[PDB]
Amino acid sequence: SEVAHRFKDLGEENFKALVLIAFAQYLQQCPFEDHVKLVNEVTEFAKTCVADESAENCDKSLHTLFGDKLCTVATLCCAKQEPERNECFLQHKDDNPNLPRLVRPEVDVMCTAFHDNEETFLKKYLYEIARRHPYFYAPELLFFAKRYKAAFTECCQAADKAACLLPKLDELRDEGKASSAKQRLKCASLQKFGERAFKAWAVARLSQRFPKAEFAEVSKLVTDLTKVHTECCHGDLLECADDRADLAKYICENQDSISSKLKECCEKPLLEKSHCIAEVENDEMPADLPSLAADFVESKDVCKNYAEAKDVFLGMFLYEYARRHPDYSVVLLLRLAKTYETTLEKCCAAADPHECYAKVFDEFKPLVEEPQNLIKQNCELFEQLGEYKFQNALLVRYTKKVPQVSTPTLVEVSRNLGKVGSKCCKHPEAKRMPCAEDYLSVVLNQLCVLHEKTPVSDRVTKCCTESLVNRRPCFSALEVDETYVPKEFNAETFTFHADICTLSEKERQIKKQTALVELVKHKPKATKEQLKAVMDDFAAFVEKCCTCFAEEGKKLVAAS
Ligand SMILES: CN(C)c1cccc2c(S(=O)(=O)N[C@@H](CC(N)=O)C(=O)O)cccc12
Numbered sequence: 001s002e003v004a005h006r007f008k009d010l011g012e013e014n015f016k017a018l019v020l021i022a023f024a025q026y027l028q029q030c031p032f033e034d035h036v037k038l039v040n041e042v043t044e045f046a047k048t049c050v051a052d053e054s055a056e057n058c059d060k061s062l063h064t065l066f067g068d069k070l071c072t073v074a075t076l077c078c079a080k081q082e083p084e085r086n087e088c089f090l091q092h093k094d095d096n097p098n099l100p101r102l103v104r105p106e107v108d109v110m111c112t113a114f115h116d117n118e119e120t121f122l123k124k125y126l127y128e129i130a131r132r133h134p135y136f137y138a139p140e141l142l143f144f145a146k147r148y149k150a151a152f153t154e155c156c157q158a159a160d161k162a163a164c165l166l167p168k169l170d171e172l173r174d175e176g177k178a179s180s181a182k183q184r185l186k187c188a189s190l191q192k193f194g195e196r197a198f199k200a201w202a203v204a205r206l207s208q209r210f211p212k213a214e215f216a217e218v219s220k221l222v223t224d225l226t227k228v229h230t231e232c233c234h235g236d237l238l239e240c241a242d243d244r245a246d247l248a249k250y251i252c253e254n255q256d257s258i259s260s261k262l263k264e265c266c267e268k269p270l271l272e273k274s275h276c277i278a279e280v281e282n283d284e285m286p287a288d289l290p291s292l293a294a295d296f297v298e299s300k301d302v303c304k305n306y307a308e309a310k311d312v313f314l315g316m317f318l319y320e321y322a323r324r325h326p327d328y329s330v331v332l333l334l335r336l337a338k339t340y341e342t343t344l345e346k347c348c349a350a351a352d353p354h355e356c357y358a359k360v361f362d363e364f365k366p367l368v369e370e371p372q373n374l375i376k377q378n379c380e381l382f383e384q385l386g387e388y389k390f391q392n393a394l395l396v397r398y399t400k401k402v403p404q405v406s407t408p409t410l411v412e413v414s415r416n417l418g419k420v421g422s423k424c425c426k427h428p429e430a431k432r433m434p435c436a437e438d439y440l441s442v443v444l445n446q447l448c449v450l451h452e453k454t455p456v457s458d459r460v461t462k463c464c465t466e467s468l469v470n471r472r473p474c475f476s477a478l479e480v481d482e483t484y485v486p487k488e489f490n491a492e493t494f495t496f497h498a499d500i501c502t503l504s505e506k507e508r509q510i511k512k513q514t515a516l517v518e519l520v521k522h523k524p525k526a527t528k529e530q531l532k533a534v535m536d537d538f539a540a541f542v543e544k545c546c547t548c549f550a551e552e553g554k555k556l557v558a559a560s
Pocket residue numbers: 137140182205206225243244245247248273274275277278279
């Protein structure tokens with residue numbers, strides 16, 4: 001009995017939480033009550049299987065049981081069976097659920113509702129998040145919940161609760177988005193490009209993290225990490241949590257053979273331990289490391305070793321180059337790896353292989369400099385413009401690259417792209433590239449998945465599917481869509497006045513930024529000067545007006 005199996009391993013508290021998340025991720029539009037009803041009904045069944053491990057259906061698989069339970073309400077896929085039935089659900093998860101934005105009541109209410117029923121208060125939290133982030137790494141969602149519970153347990157019992165709660169809540173809201181985004185990239189990678197692509201990502205990443213680890217150790221880590229993520233992303237949340245639990249147990253036992261930063265991590269509670277390992281900083285780089293050119297360029301057995309086991313061999317190259325380059329982004333390491341593999345592939349067939357692949361590190365020169373130069377440039381501009389203006393610049397730049405993309409998606413992505421400047425430009429040259437390049441992959445993957453829903457730009461499709469590690473370069477190369485035909489003006493498409501006033505400060509920029517997009521979709525060929533000009537005026541119509549809706553706005557459309 002697979003269910004009984006897992007119920008024991010995870011206990012009841014987690015089992016309940018994990019199944020609530022799975023449901024809230026498969027049927028994101030269903031009310032809280034229904035999921036609650038199904039979790040309990042499901043939980044009871046689990047309890048009876050613990051006893052008689054042969055009580056009617058305790059033999060069935062998790063999918064079967066979860067499927068049948070959801071179909072008792074999903075009729076608000078179910079026509080299919082076991083394999084097809086599950087895949088169906090997976091293809092219908094929605095990255096952009098049009099749910100009502102969540103609004104936070106007065107601190108007073110939250111505290112009362114928390115104190116009264118704590119288990120309910122926390123379940124609805126997990127519920128709200130899971131439905132909005134159908135791919136959130138389940139195991140980490142429990143860490144946020146515990147961290148969420150601590151916020152209230154401490155603040156609701158203090159002088160100025162609000163001053164205590166709000167900040168801590170903000171911090172969580174953000175980090176949750178970051179976490180959700182990182183996770184979305186791992187799943188996309190697994191689902192769209194295959195496990196080979198995720199493994200490569202892992203080797204490079206863990207190699208940078210655990211420089212001291214021997215190649216076969218990392219490989220061991222990579223293989224399990226892959227299973228964990230493969231399972232969470234496919235919805236096998238219980239087995240994900242389990243395997244994720246083992247992996248942490250393992251990593252802590254074998255500490256010394258891995259990294260010397262895993263100390264602080266391995267002496268705390270499961271959840272906290274897991275989160276700690278996953279985010280552990282890189283380990284100090286080994287003292288005496290032979291130059292790479294030794295076994296990978298100069299040696300004359302390259303093609304032989306490549307022929308025998310291209311996988312392991314290339315795998316080794318990645319590990320070696322990565323372990324000593326924590327100043328490189330994972331994506332740059334995968335590009336280099338791809339360039340090396342391509343070189344051997346051709347060189348090895350040639351007459352004198354050695355002569356052909358002897359200058360491979362000169363092929364790397366351009367690949368390493370491109371990111372550095374791009375980053376150096378963009379942080380300069382950033383420091384000169386500030387976050388807001390910098391976001392505006394990217395808004396214009398991106399709308400010109402892919403005009404078809406919907407305004408809400410352009411606004412969301414450009415704003416996130418701007419945040420990369422705030423998060424990374426502060427770090428020193430040394431840590432900029434991992435920060436920047438890896439962050440840009442997460443944000444451009446957001447654009448790619450939101451776009452995969454309703455595709456309107458072949459230039460976006462091509463950059464998103466041609467290659468995973470080259471997405472950023474593909475997008476950066478785009479300039480302005482020359483075949484794009486401008487759009488006509490639509491009165492209501494630039495609509496507002498006073499209702500925008502009650503709106504927060506940020507809610508206002510997101511209003512001027514939305515207009516800016518619309519404007520460029522109208523005047524593609526316009527210039528940085530013009531827009532920057534017509535922009536200022538936009539503020540005016542906000543202060544003046546704040547019926548001027550129609551009046552002050554008429555003097556706006558005219559001048560526009
Ligand atoms: C604790 N065990 C089980 C782990 C779980 C999830 C990710 C882990 C990672 S990781 O490198 O994938 N860490 C991820 C973050 C994450 N939460 O997945 C990253 O830096 O992109 C390394 C080592 C252990 C991990």
